[PDB]
Design a protein around this ligand. Structure first.
Ligand SMILES: [Mg+2]
Ligand SMILES: [Mg+2]
Ligand SMILES: [Mg+2]
Ligand SMILES: [Mg+2]
Ligand SMILES: [Mg+2]
Ligand SMILES: [Mg+2]
Ligand SMILES: [Mg+2]
Ligand SMILES: [Mg+2]
Ligand SMILES: [Mg+2]
Ligand SMILES: [Mg+2]
Ligand SMILES: [Mg+2]
Ligand SMILES: [Mg+2]
Ligand SMILES: [Mg+2]
Ligand SMILES: [Mg+2]
Ligand SMILES: [Mg+2]
Ligand SMILES: [Mg+2]
Ligand SMILES: [Mg+2]
Lengths: 250, 308, 99, 72, 115, 158
RNA sequence: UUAAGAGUUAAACCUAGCCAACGAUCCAUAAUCGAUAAUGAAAGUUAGAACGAUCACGUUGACUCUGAAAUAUAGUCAAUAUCUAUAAGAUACAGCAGUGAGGAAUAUUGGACAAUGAUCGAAAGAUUGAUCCAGUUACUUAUUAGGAUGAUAUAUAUAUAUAUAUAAAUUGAUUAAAAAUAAAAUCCAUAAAUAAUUAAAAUAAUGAUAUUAAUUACCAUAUAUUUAUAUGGAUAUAUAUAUAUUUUAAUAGUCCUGACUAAUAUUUGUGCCAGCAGUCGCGGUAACACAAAGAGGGCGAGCGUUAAUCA
């Protein structure tokens, strides 16, 4: 039996009571407000645990089940805070032992419902520099470095390319203070990883704007075939991108 | 593509590929998808709703059907084979931007692409549907990445009023410190866990007038001398940048900060490399999704038959 | 580069009148300037009001003058007096009846 | 139930149900006929189209307007 | 162009984006009908080049794929190439200057054969 | 779309590739041997038997296969300028150069086609001759299988 | 007779055969096919529009010349129907536009031979309703068709959970009943426009398309390897030179909500009537099914319905 079910919170929350007729409020909005907490004059929600990013290389992901739906905490002391019948946030009646009892992997699990999802580790900048020096300068092949550092070859090659771009930007100082701040912030939000054919180029006399290039090919294999299927007016219309990035019909 | 409408409605409670606060709450309160007391068709429909709200909301249904690949790829724990239902979308350029944390949404990444801020191997790509091959390197203009991962720049009026309030509270603090300095210092240490000149060093600030400061931002810049924001209106250190200029991470960023496996990211340069297509492995899937394997398999059975 | 006027072709107007094909109406457009005749392409001719057939023909004859090949007029092909092949039989039947 | 006897352009003769709240069809009106039978009436195998020929759209129709030839 | 057998270009592709098929065909048959043989393909549009690459010194390249040994067989038999096919084959070195015409100086780049 | 799967998933047809030499060459001995080998008559037979009469107005045996001599085609078709009788001509030199190129091209084509046929036939024959080694080594492996036999009748042998 | 076999056609003379319930003969219908299109897990089934291959025809029938090849879109004769020139006349749009009829229904009385071909010519070059382009038509397919932030408005007095008041607060409802982050507002963009310039289709030259694609938001050069600081022509200003250097958005329908079958937030009108309906079926004062309001669920520049094909 399927029913159009308004997505009310699974946890218990303080619902509406008798309301002024002109309030025009909904329970979902109250749940929103209780999840967030008071709104600062700056527009912030400091009371929430998720307003501010972490800074100790331990990602902070939503844990509504392990929190029983209580998502408010003191911004400084970081001790839990919960709503009260008085209407002012105050200390909980009892300790929530399950917030203390977090599995090692669940700390790295982004979404509660999907256990298989996990966040990759960020390589330390020193490790990136070490890989770049080992490959570019010493000459150790990507296989050797991957075996050395427990990494995959394509990741190693991507690291080399990115460190090349980083080197160029640092040479020109194209990096800005905002970019450095974002880099340092994001780096601290994630756990840190611990260690032939015949070709003829035709003659180009002066004033020619382009050069013919002839590639050898065999009859029965070269050409556009006659009676080929026309897919343009069909859903499987083939589309590609020219090297300029222009969309073309391939 | 689909015209965005009621994407973040709390009644519907569908999680979207976004860093928004409303999306955060919708993810928070959902718990898990309810597939119980439902026929097979109803289970498939619920799985479609939940999964298709996240993976490709913009894609048209009759377009997603054509894009959908009935044959998946997989390289003791159990392999989650059917989480790869939507792995085909992970090679699209906009999805790559969103997963690289170069945008706060797939739609925002789409606008970044369509507005010419994105390059793939050094050629400006203006088409969100461009598919990334393994080893491709794609980059975004750093200003747009900083805007995506930064707080909204306040208007002049909003930040001016915020400064008004900050002056009011700073004057309050120094007043109370002057009245009762010794225990003020001791109790401040109480949180941190006597020199009477301490309160003497602190200096008042003059309340500003909105009517007189309106429309004169260079004047307002000189008129503010708070200890923390010296000579700039709040959030507008350089008012010619697209973001909160004393660069501040956007609110509610920790919940959605997943580092993808298939991409290798360089935040300092706003570059990324597409290592591979996402592949399921024993006990882990590289398709970042908020739904469990049962939901994905129900969606997969739906799309195999096209709803039959 | 520009080729110099010949004694056969002193000025632009001589060239226009010689090549014919009703092109002699374009004397004003060129303003008798040899150099401008031998410098601009069909985009400028299009802007200046020359229609398709003309500007193509004048560029052809300009090229002929550049490579020294003669620029004499060759009249565009006309249909037969009795008429086109498809209508020739009926027209001959009518014409012979009238005479 | 309102039905009409219709001679088609191929020469056949059929019985067609006139849907909608109000029919503006009289004798010798020009109509367009589509398939579909009036389930509770035996012998009316066809549906007259509303909004074509001499049949107008259902007056003051505001839902399923397309099926009944209405405008908005 | 004369004779029954002619080496021509048959137009393939879509509107506003021609590509051509170097074919050996009957003169009397339609341009886009199936020919005696398909000797190659010719993409007229030059490969676009970056403004930087213009300064570096490369030029746009036009892609022709051809069967060199078979085209020699057809030229030997007396198949008569067309003007565009004559231009293409003459640049390839298959045809020498004997096929040049009066209507058609220095060499920046001489023809080169490589693997 | 289904039928294309039979041909490597290729939609559209090329014209059937033509043959430079329409009939086997003389140097291609194998086709001559098959052609001039004894004709089999029997359950699987190709010709009228010895005492059997063929129809009065028909030929008893099929038309003989005319084997091309590549030298003969090159001499008759292509040939050579018998004499160098000529003078300076705007068209004469052009035509001579054209004809020389065409002559060279057709000669090369015929020779290369003969060469590919010969090399291919030798290739197939060689492959079969090496496969003979596999057969004979298998037979040798049967010897060692039955070298260790005590001559008692065995069920597998029964 | 033919280049050529054969009761293929004509002549002559013999024999009595040949086909047939595994369907002859006759009748009706149909152009056939693919490495084409649709569908299915597949065998297959359907179409034969589009791309391509073969055949037949060019108002109807027969015959003749030429020719290698023709019962030719040729010629003669006749038939049908029109026109004038009234003659041992011409024409037959199944060539491109276009008109009338028939139909549920299928477009421009368009531009250019610039390209790729065809014909003529020694050549220059000429012709080309082939062809290439554009026009009309959502008929089909693809890409765009805006992101981020966002539940209040006033007054008070190197820290930071700021707190107090008052005022208002649309629809529905009195709480897990919502509409609704939806609006507005704010931040930031881009399209279009406006300026420049500007390829490529084509080269010896020739560009219909074309008010070209695309690039930059003053213009170049001079270095580095896209971002920069410089030199030089712009630029109004105030008073050669400190300054800045076009502007700028937002635009969604159509079907459905008893089950099949996704659609709980509820109300009104009607009362076996009006009506709905693919099947079950609904409609007699309490209609989740008719007609509507609210809310909701699909698909979305399409949605539904009819007609057909496959499963
Ligand atoms: Mg239901
Ligand atoms: Mg003449
Ligand atoms: Mg028929
Ligand atoms: Mg049939
Ligand atoms: Mg037919
Ligand atoms: Mg066809
Ligand atoms: Mg047609
Ligand atoms: Mg005929
Ligand atoms: Mg007719
Ligand atoms: Mg006839
Ligand atoms: Mg017509
Ligand atoms: Mg032409
Ligand atoms: Mg014309
Ligand atoms: Mg009310
Ligand atoms: Mg209805
Ligand atoms: Mg119903
Ligand atoms: Mg569409």
């Amino acid at each position: 039996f399927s029913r159009r079910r308004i997505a009310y919170p699974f946890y218990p929350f303080k619902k509406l009571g008798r309301q002024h007729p002109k309030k025009h409020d909904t329970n979902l909005k109250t749940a929103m407000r209780q999840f967030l907490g008071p709104k600062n004059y700056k527009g912030e929600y400091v009371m929430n645990k998720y307003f501010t990013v972490p800074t100790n290389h331990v990602p902070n992901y939503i844990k509504p089940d392990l929190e029983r739906g209580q998502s408010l905490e003191h911004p400084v002391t970081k001790k839990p805070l919960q709503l009260r019948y008085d209407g002012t946030l105050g200390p909980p009646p009892v300790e929530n032992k399950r917030l203390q009892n977090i599995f090692k992997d669940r700390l790295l699990q982004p979404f509660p419902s999907n256990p298989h999802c996990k966040t990759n580790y960020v390589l330390s900048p020193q490790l990136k520099q070490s890989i770049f020096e080992e490959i570019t300068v010493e000459g150790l092949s990507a296989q050797q470095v991957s075996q050395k550092y427990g990494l995959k070859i394509p990741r190693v090659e991507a690291i080399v390319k990115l460190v090349s771009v980083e080197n160029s930007w640092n040479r020109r100082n194209r990096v800005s203070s905002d970019l450095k701040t974002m880099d340092e912030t994001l780096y601290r939000m994630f756990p840190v990883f611990d260690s032939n054919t015949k070709v003829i180029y035709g003659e180009l006399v002066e004033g020619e704007r382009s050069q013919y290039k002839f590639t050898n090919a065999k009859v029965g294999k070269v050409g556009y075939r006659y009676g080929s299927g026309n897919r343009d007016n069909k859903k499987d219309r083939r589309i590609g991108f020219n090297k300029l990035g222009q969309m073309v019909y391939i | 593509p689909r015209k965005a409408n009621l994407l973040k409605s709390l009644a519907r409670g569908r999680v979207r590929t976004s860093f928004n606060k409303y999306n955060l709450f919708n993810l928070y309160k959902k718990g898990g998808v309810d597939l119980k007391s439902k026929s097979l068709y109803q289970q498939k429909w619920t799985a479609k709703q939940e999964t298709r709200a996240y993976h490709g909301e913009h894609l048209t249904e009759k377009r997603w059907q054509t894009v959908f690949k009935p044959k998946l790829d997989s390289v003791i724990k159990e392999t989650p084979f059917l989480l790869q239902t939507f792995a085909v979308l992970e090679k699209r350029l906009d999805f790559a931007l969103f997963r690289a944390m170069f945008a706060s949404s797939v739609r925002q990444a789409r606008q970044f692409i369509l507005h010419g801020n994105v390059r793939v191997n050094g050629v400006k790509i203006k088409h969100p549907s461009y598919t990334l091959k393994p080893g491709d390197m794609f980059s975004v203009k750093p200003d747009k990445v900083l805007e995506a991962l930064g707080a909204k720049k306040p208007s002049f009026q909003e930040a001016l009023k915020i400064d008004k309030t900050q002056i009011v509270l700073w004057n309050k603090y120094v007043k109370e410190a002057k009245t009762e300095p010794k225990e003020v210092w001791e109790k401040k240490l109480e949180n941190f866990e006597f020199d009477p000149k301490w309160a003497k060093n602190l200096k008042y600030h003059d309340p500003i007038k909105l009517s007189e400061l309106e429309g004169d931002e260079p004047k307002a810049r000189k008129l503010i001398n708070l200890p923390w924001q010296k000579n700039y209106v709040y959030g507008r250190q350089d008012p010619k940048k697209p973001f909160f200029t004393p660069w501040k991470p956007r609110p509610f960023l920790s919940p959605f900060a997943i580092l993808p496996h298939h991409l290798e990211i360089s935040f300092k340069t706003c570059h990324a490399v597409y290592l591979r297509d996402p592949v399921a492995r024993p006990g882990q899937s590289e398709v970042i999704s908020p739904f469990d394997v049962p939901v994905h398999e129900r969606a997969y059975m739906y799309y195999l038959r096209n709803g039959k | 580069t520009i080729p110099k006027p010949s004694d056969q072709v002193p000025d632009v107007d001589a060239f226009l009148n010689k090549i014919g094909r009703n092109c002699n109406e374009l004397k004003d457009t060129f303003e008798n300037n040899w150099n401008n005749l031998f410098q601009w392409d069909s985009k400028i001719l299009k802007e200046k009001g020359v229609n398709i057939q003309q500007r193509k023909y004048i560029l052809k004859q300009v090229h002929n003058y550049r490579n020294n090949r003669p620029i004499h007029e060759i009249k565009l092909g006309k249909k037969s007096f009795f008429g086109g092949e498809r209508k020739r039989k009926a027209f001959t039947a009518k014409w012979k009846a009238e005479n | 139930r309102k039905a009409c006897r219709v001679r088609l352009t191929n020469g056949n003769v059929v019985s067609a149900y006139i849907p909608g709240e109000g029919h503006d069809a009289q004798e010798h009106s020009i109509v367009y006929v589509r398939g579909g039978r009036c389930q509770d009436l035996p012998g009316v195998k066809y549906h007259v189209i509303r909004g074509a020929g001499d049949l107008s759209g259902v007056v003051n129709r505001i839902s399923s307007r397309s099926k009944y030839g209405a405008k908005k | 162009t004369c004779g029954l057998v002619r080496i021509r270009l048959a137009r393939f592709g879509r509107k506003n984006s021609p590509v051509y098929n170097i074919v050996v065909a009957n003169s009397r048959k339609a341009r886009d009908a199936k020919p005696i043989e398909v000797l190659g393909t010719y993409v007229p549009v030059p490969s676009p080049v970056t403004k930087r690459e213009l300064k570096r010194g490369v030029v746009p390249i036009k892609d022709v794929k051809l069967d060199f040994d078979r085209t020699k067989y057809w030229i030997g038999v007396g198949a008569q190439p067309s003007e565009t096919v004559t231009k293409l084959l003459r640049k390839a070195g298959i045809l020498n200057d004997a096929w040049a015409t009066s209507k058609n100086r220095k060499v920046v780049f001489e023809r080169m054969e490589t693997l | 779309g289904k039928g294309a799967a039979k041909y490597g998933f290729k939609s559209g047809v090329f014209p059937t590739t033509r043959s430079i030499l329409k009939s086997p060459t003389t140097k291609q001995t194998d086709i001559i041997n098959k052609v001039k080998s004894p004709k089999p008559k029997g359950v699987l037979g190709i010709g009228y038997a010895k005492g059997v009469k063929h129809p009065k107005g028909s030929h008893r045996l099929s038309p003989k296969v005319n084997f091309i001599d590549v030298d003969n085609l090159i001499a008759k078709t292509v040939a050579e300028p018998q004499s160098i009788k000529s003078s300076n001509g705007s068209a004469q030199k052009v035509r001579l150069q054209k004809a020389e190129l065409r002559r060279k091209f057709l000669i090369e084509a015929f020779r290369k086609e003969e060469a590919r046929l010969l090399h291919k036939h030798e290739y197939l024959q060689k492959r079969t001759k090496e496969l003979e080694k596999a057969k004979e080594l298998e037979l040798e492996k049967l010897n060692k299988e039955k070298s260790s036999d005590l001559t008692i009748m065995t069920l597998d042998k029964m």
